[PDB]
Design an enzyme around this catalytic site. Structure first.
Site, short mmCIF file in Angstrom:
data_model
loop_
_atom_site.label_atom_id
_atom_site.label_comp_id
_atom_site.label_asym_id
_atom_site.label_seq_id
_atom_site.Cartn_x
_atom_site.Cartn_y
_atom_site.Cartn_z
N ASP B 334 0.77 -0.84 0.07
CA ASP B 334 0.21 -0.02 -0.02
C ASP B 334 0.59 1.47 -0.49
O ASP B 334 1.52 1.29 -0.74
CB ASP B 334 -1.09 -0.70 1.39
N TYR B 465 -1.44 11.53 2.89
CA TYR B 465 -2.29 11.64 1.37
C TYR B 465 -2.15 12.93 1.80
O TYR B 465 -2.49 14.12 -0.07
CB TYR B 465 -3.57 11.13 1.71
N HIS B 523 -7.18 -5.88 -1.00
CA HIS B 523 -6.79 -5.65 -0.13
C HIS B 523 -5.12 -6.04 0.48
O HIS B 523 -5.04 -5.16 0.51
CB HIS B 523 -7.59 -3.79 -0.12
O1 LIG Z 1 -5.00 5.10 -0.80
C1 LIG Z 1 -4.56 3.82 -0.51
N1 LIG Z 1 -4.51 2.67 -0.27
C2 LIG Z 1 -5.52 2.35 0.74
C3 LIG Z 1 -5.37 2.05 2.24
C4 LIG Z 1 -6.49 1.75 2.46
C5 LIG Z 1 -7.43 2.05 1.95
N2 LIG Z 1 -8.26 1.75 3.20
O2 LIG Z 1 -10.13 1.82 2.68
O3 LIG Z 1 -8.42 1.58 4.68
C6 LIG Z 1 -7.88 2.69 1.10
C7 LIG Z 1 -7.24 2.71 -0.19
N3 LIG Z 1 -3.14 4.61 -1.53
C8 LIG Z 1 -1.56 3.86 -0.93
C9 LIG Z 1 -1.03 2.77 -1.93
S1 LIG Z 1 -1.03 3.90 -3.36
C10 LIG Z 1 -2.33 5.67 -3.05
C11 LIG Z 1 -2.00 6.41 -4.22
C12 LIG Z 1 -1.44 7.88 -4.23
C13 LIG Z 1 -1.22 8.61 -4.90
C14 LIG Z 1 -1.58 8.49 -6.38
C15 LIG Z 1 -2.89 6.57 -6.71
C16 LIG Z 1 -2.40 6.60 -5.50
C17 LIG Z 1 -3.00 5.34 -2.66
#
Ligand SMILES: O=C(Nc1ccc([N+](=O)[O-])cc1)N1CCS[C@@H](c2ccccc2)C1
Ligand SMILES: O=C(Nc1ccc([N+](=O)[O-])cc1)N1CCS[C@@H](c2ccccc2)C1
Lengths: 546, 546
Positions: B334, B465, B523
């Site tokens: 992740d 983020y 995930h």
């Molecule tokens: O949002 C992410 N993962 C994530 C983790 C947990 C949850 N969650 O809902 O627990 C949702 C998304 N990501 C992490 C790995 S790359 C990251 C990303 C960054 C920039 C552009 C596109 C994607 C997004």
């Protein structure tokens, strides 16, 4: 007035200069003079090398571009390159041959010790070669001794561009007249000089250092042999393992390679190995410097029996189990030296090799009570003083700074008598209230021991002496054994408690025993003679402990 | 009613039995039947072997005594031993050939999982051979799964002596009728039976396990494939490194060998690698499982900019510097997967090899703002919800148990929609107050995440983020580079945020990239499919990362 010294890497802090290998290669291969150095600089600010040094591309992407430039140059010079011509091989060998310029590093170390801010400023690349670790190791060893490391490939700027010099001054928080800048490239020195920095063109190290000491007013040449690198407690990795419900063990960890477990004595710390930790890690070992049970950040339960050798050794085995280590080489000093011989006797499968500083291996006499054996030696009187719970604790805990300043003394510094301690009524009854500072320690190092001992005091530490009978009975179970794993006995000439002659019969129980001997060395082996301890341990480790 | 199971080591928990090699040797060397087994037991309770098993002498002292017994036996049998006859070679090979009996271990694991106290009771020796580490490793792997390990050479008692059985019952705190005892030696079983213990003579494993399941009433044979070994947080070595004045990094450390740095994602923990840590260490690696900046026991400063990739990566490099590691293999999942690709791009000299679970490597588009790029994908709507400081913190922090139970779900467990999160007004607006427990986690595992997040909450984690523009500008500096160090991309079929197809162009920037793919995996890769993650990582590590 100068307050900052900046050093280049290639041709200054590390030799031979990776640059000079292009010249060497031309000569060895009988190619036209400067042909390789010309292909290397082709395109100047817009060429492949500048892109590499600015971090636009990595070393592996640059290699074919350098090869194309070599061909273009050879075509113009109307010459042929050899059949087996390889830029990769040339650079692999050049980087591997490049070692730290020890006198230049010693000078930077001395300037930093005298209050200077020091930095490395280098035109370097992003190294993704299969053999990149060698350079990584080099950069690691060097960078630790400096306030800043500025790498062209990380800042996206390159010497001789004026921006990198303004970036240097901004990181140094200094005006140019306050900075000495040392470089082997005259062109890379010009922008520093143009800003008003004191500059030194480095050809041979000696002349550069004479220029450097003339300009700073600090002796850097012909100076005495410096002490090995010490440890800053707040810069270390601190580890903690619970070995049983109420007992946790603390340790400081540095380096990679075979695990080396350092076991201190009484009344000490992990910090007693401060001069050994960086050296042993540099030598290719993973150092685990313990706070032994009863000390520093390790648990100190009050019960006497929590400190018998059988339990201390069982816990050290659990410590290895929890870290996932099948073995470690065990190196002990004083009470830690005693534990390490017992680790070899009871758990040989967990002990890669065993070394003791000062503490000899003497088998238990089954025909005499341990009290009798201790009473027979007049130097061991202080041990009888340590027996009654609370008595030595009160005296050792009364004034911590006085305790450590009185104990930690070199053989020529009015040590402390260890006979008629009971008759005298204490360890410090004939000692001053405000002892002088031994040359072995700084005031700050003393205050580290004071602060550590503020947590648990001397109850746990003194309890190591309070299990004579228990340890004697357990040791008697091992009387038919021999120590047959690799073993080192290091004797200290002037330790008058743990005398070298006490170790004379060890061969009878450890036939293949190896030895080390340190002359003009008192009881506090590690801080008394750190350079020689390091030399003896690294030599034995590389020969006998993998 | 049974409540304790005791297993022998040789011929029971480990196979082939080191004992059976004397028979094999007699046959291979055409010596009289039982000649070697007879020399081995010579003198019975008073012989060399009993002294060895009681711990009176070590394995290396025993070797010549066994050789003398072999000669005495051959003299009586009127036979000659071979020219190159070596007891050491025979035992070195026998011990090295002896491996864990996996179905027997699985049965002991199942019994312990169902509330039984389990122990290993073994007649063993003090091993001081040069090759003693192999047995040390074996004993380490086995012992962790049991409540007690009783070794004859440590207790000074031996099977079949009645005292060792009374010692066993005392350590078990159980009456004999409550104990099952499994042994391959009928004579060693008799004293346990004589006391009233349920006993099992072990010849073939399958029959022994049928007898064992009949007697306990627990299914042990033909049972489903068990999960890999997990971690008990209080049994781990916990490490702490200060990387700068206000920032310290926490990690869990296990094993020896090349350093492997595990980097978790959002909103996770070092504990997300719980099924990987024991397996990777067993595979010959030194595992460093991080609490990433903002998480668990690592510092969580409030500033957004403390969480941009440039600073996170710089700190991870400082972390290696302080531990004295020139390199580590970096494995991320992740947000940790994103960091690990950036470690490979900016610090290739510090990265031995790089692997990512789910997170692909996608270069920055220099002709589009990162906001635009995120807005283009409907699945990335939740990221816009995460932008405004305090909003997602309030919802994620309101009910911790609900947060983790809602997030941590397998692909078939009504996951959580990630589109129209902003329109909906939150992540859990269409979610129950009391979510059901996913089959991936226990209630206790959920409460570990709840407890960890009680310290700093979601500010630091959400800040990963909040640096889109900052990360985009830094990433643009690397647009001319390629990833040329060893690299692994692991895709998860049913991760609907990090879809396998998003990784399809990676070869353009990582030409030598290796891949792994996990079907029917959501995930939460590590806990969703731990067995397959372990298999893919160990295979790639042993081939590409030394
Ligand atoms: O949002 C992410 N993962 C994530 C983790 C947990 C949850 N969650 O809902 O627990 C949702 C998304 N990501 C992490 C790995 S790359 C990251 C990303 C960054 C920039 C552009 C596109 C994607 C997004
Ligand atoms: O007392 C010891 N060392 C020591 C350490 C510090 C001081 N001190 O005064 O600081 C004095 C003695 N020893 C530790 C190593 S072996 C131990 C010992 C134990 C049993 C029999 C003889 C000797 C004595």
């Amino acid at each position: 007035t100068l307050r900052a010294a900046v050093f280049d890497l290639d041709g200054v802090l590390a030799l031979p200069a990776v640059f000079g290998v292009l010249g060497r290669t031309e000569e060895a291969l009988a190619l036209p003079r400067g042909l390789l150095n010309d292909a290397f600089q082709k395109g100047g600010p817009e060429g492949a090398t500048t892109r590499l040094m600015k971090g636009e591309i990595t070393l592996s992407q640059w290699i074919p571009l350098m090869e194309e430039n070599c061909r273009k140059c050879s075509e113009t010079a109307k010459v042929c390159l050899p059949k087996n011509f390889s830029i990769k091989e040339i650079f692999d060998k050049a980087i591997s041959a490049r070692k730290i310029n020890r006198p230049m590093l010693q000078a930077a170390l001395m300037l930093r010790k005298k209050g200077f801010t020091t930095a490395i400023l280098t035109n370097t690349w992003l190294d993704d070669r299969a053999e990149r670790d060698g350079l990584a190791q080099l950069m690691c060893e060097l960078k630790m001794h400096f306030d800043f490391l500025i790498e062209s490939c990380q800042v996206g700027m390159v010497k001789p561009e004026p921006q990198i010099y303004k970036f240097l001054l901004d990181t140094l928080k200094a005006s140019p007249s306050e900075v000495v800048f040392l470089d082997d490239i005259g062109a890379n020195l010009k922008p520093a000089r143009d800003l008003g920095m004191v500059t030194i063109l480095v050809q041979d190290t000696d002349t550069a250092l004479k220029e450097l000491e003339k300009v700073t007013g600090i002796q850097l040449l012909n100076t005495p042999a410096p002490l090995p690198t010490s440890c800053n407690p707040s810069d270390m990795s601190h580890g903690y393992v619970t070995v049983k419900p109420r007992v946790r063990l603390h340790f400081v960890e540095l380096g990679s390679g075979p695990a080396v477990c350092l076991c201190h004595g009484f009344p000490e710390s992990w910090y007693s190995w401060r001069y050994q930790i960086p050296a042993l890690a540099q030598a290719g070992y993973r150092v685990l410097a313990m706070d032994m049970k009863g000390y520093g950040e390790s648990s100190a339960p009050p019960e006497i029996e929590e400190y018998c050798m059988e339990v201390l050794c069982k816990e050290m085995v659990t410590f290895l189990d929890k870290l996932g280590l099948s073995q470690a080489v065990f190196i002990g000093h004083d009470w830690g030296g005693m534990l390490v011989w017992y680790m070899a006797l009871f758990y040989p499968e967990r002990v890669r090799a065993v070394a003791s500083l000062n503490t000899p291996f003497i088998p238990a006499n089954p025909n005499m009570s341990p009290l009798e054996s201790i009473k027979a030696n007049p130097v061991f009187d202080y041990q009888l003083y340590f027996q009654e719970p609370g008595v030595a604790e009160a005296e050792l805990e009364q004034n911590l700074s006085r305790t450590f300043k009185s104990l930690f003394r070199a053989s020529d510094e009015s040590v402390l008598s260890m006979h008629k301690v009971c008759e005298a009524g204490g360890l410090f009854v004939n000692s001053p209230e405000e002892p002088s500072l031994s040359r072995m320690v700084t005031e700050e190092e003393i205050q580290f021991y004071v602060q550590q001992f503020k947590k648990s005091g001397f109850r746990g530490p003194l309890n190591w002496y309070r299990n004579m009978e228990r340890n004697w009975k357990w040791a008697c179970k091992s009387l038919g054994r021999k120590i047959l794993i690799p073993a080192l006995m290091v004797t200290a000439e002037k330790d008058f408690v743990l005398v070298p002659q006490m170790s004379q019969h060890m061969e009878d129980w450890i036939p293949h025993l190896k030895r080390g001997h340190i002359e003009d060395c008192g009881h506090w082996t590690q801080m008394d003679k750190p350079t020689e301890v390091n030399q003896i341990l690294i030599k034995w480790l590389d020969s006998d402990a993998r």
